[PDB]
Amino acid sequence: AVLILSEARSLGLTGYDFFWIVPSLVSGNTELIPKEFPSGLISVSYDDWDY
């Protein structure tokens, strides 16, 4: 995922109208986010703040 994002930012695929959707297993623990993840990235995941 990190390599794909880095290779896609340089290709212009990451602009003001480009919505990325990502499965639950990429957002591992929501506490080790790298620097290549663009802002506004929807990714459904299981709950840990509640329950």
């Binding site: 340089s10 290709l11 212009g12 602009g15």
Partner: protein, 50 residues
């Protein structure tokens, strides 16, 4: 000159996306600017290597 010729013409030509790309040749902006073109005929004005 091409603008002047196309303007005062009796046939009527359609023209879109007049690109003037000068920023490296593979750095983001050139890619999208080249991707904007979707018609099929191209006029380009360069110097051999470019």
């Amino acid at each position: 000159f091409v603008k002047t010729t196309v303007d005062n013409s009796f046939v009527g030509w359609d023209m879109q996306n007049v690109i003037t790309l000068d920023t490296s040749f593979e750095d983001a902006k050139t890619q999208v600017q080249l991707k904007k073109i979707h018609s099929s005929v191209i006029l380009l004005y360069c110097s051999k290597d470019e």
